[PDB]
Design a protein around this ligand. Sequence first.
Ligand SMILES: [Cl-]
Ligand SMILES: [Cl-]
Lengths: 336, 336
Amino acid sequence: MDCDHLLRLGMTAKKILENGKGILAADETPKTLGRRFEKLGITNTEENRRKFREILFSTKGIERYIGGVILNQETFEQTSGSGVPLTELLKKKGIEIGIKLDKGLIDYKEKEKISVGLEDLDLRCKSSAFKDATFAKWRSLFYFYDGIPSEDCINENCSILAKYAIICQKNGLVPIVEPEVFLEGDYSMKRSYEVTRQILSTLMKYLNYELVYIPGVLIKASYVTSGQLSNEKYTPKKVATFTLRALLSTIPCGIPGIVFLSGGHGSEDAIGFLNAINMERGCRTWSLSFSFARALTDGVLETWRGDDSNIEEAQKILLETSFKACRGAEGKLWDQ
Amino acid sequence: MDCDHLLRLGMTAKKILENGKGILAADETPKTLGRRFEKLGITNTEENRRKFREILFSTKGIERYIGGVILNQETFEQTSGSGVPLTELLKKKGIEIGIKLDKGLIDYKEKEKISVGLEDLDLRCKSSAFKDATFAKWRSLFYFYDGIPSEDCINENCSILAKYAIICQKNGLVPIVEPEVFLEGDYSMKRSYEVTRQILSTLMKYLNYELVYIPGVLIKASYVTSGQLSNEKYTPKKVATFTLRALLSTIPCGIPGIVFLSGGHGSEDAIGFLNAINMERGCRTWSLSFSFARALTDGVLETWRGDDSNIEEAQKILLETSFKACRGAEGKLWDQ
Ligand SMILES: [Cl-]
Ligand SMILES: [Cl-]
């Protein structure tokens, strides 16, 4: 953690988000991807998981819009049908390679979760498997119910995210910290707004207590909305207003970027909220961009359907959806 | 706290710091001012306290450099030798009038302090005495010793500052929150840096939990330095680097300004640190300005000495020192 080392982290963080670019999240575990596959009639074979990632990474022109890709650990060991390591597809395109490093969630208190995997995190960061990686991702999830998220759960998850962040940085990796506010729940938008302010301000506390290099951290955040079980409606403008207010209230000038997660929102909504937040006035130093899994790849899966003859059309949908995300990241989706 | 009400707070906060201006702190209690008087041979009469404030507020041209003045409660009841309410001197000059609203400190745990006065704060904000005030100030103080500041003390003081802040805002006053890191102590600059990051990030947590309107809050902060009993040396550049890093790591884009306290540092040092921090590169949305008591008024007291025939020269020193502070607030002290 000398001057040069820190500057490298900051440069990586900015490179990922240059020129309206964002992040393609492709880090689903076999179990998470398998559920997605099964809804659409695709067998959850390793081969189909490998091919899916090949389809994504080999999309021609995707590097104009995508500055980094978050890989699942198993994908680092996989090759294209033509023999080339899947990581090489991305490296040749100049796209930064990331690694998801959490080991999922376990129960905490009543009805809440913490994320796990810190105990061997430093050893894992040093794995030869991930030698080409320059950034990482770790997810916590905040369930909402009557008196929840509890303060204990906010504190513990923020502590875990911060401890992961410092270990990443000490290993030369830019950490993405992902404090996801779970969409499946019954809560008002005002409640999401207030809890988002609690979570993000607390996350910044723990990052500071762990003496994380703030210019070398990316925050992957949920949009501020009401819960999916709420009867409450909202529009892109309202999501933009509330989300940007929460961020302006909580995120220090030194953070280089916020990258939104799609979170169960539609592709259309996720991109529209991004565009809307980037048209909002309100001085800020950080980029507002994207780290989408479903918003970018649901259409690819729905087009592909496990049939090689649908691959070209699936790649076209990725490229077009990635274009729109990038235009949204600059607030230009209505233009040209 | 409707839209218009909030916008007024933000406008006040920006007006105070327009055009490189800063804050003249004149809010010393009779006891605090009296100690200063007695060192220099001036009797601690109410008359001498009144005259001192008249000397300050009637300084010709001071409004070019001073955007607001923090008054002590007793000063709102006082008049010039010519009969004019002291607040009228400032109002006629277009300078914002502030009120210090804390009731001082009491013991907390072992060797620490909390600030007090919340219980009647709302009633006091509504006093007809303060009807011309548009902003307020509240001070906490953090002593440093082996395992101190304790986490309990950081949390409690930040909670108190945030509770004061929200009450101010609900009464139409912009709160200045002052988490002063006490200079008298034995600690390294690295320790001050790390603890400053703890305190400021925690203060932002509590401001967010109290749902304070962040664009309507000013932070009056200590420079990051080693303690006065430390043998450790530092220069303006090092103070600038460490202080700006701490601020970039902790203070959200929405905060309109940071105003440094002089804190026992010399006038010369306090202004020099300000200039140095304003020459630092590093993108930020907030102003870096001043809220000085001693740095601006020690020279006035030392020149005046309680003799009317020294008043003109005392006012000249205030104006010249205020000029330098303002040039420092723009990073221009070496120029023109
Ligand atoms: Cl997953
Ligand atoms: Cl005082």
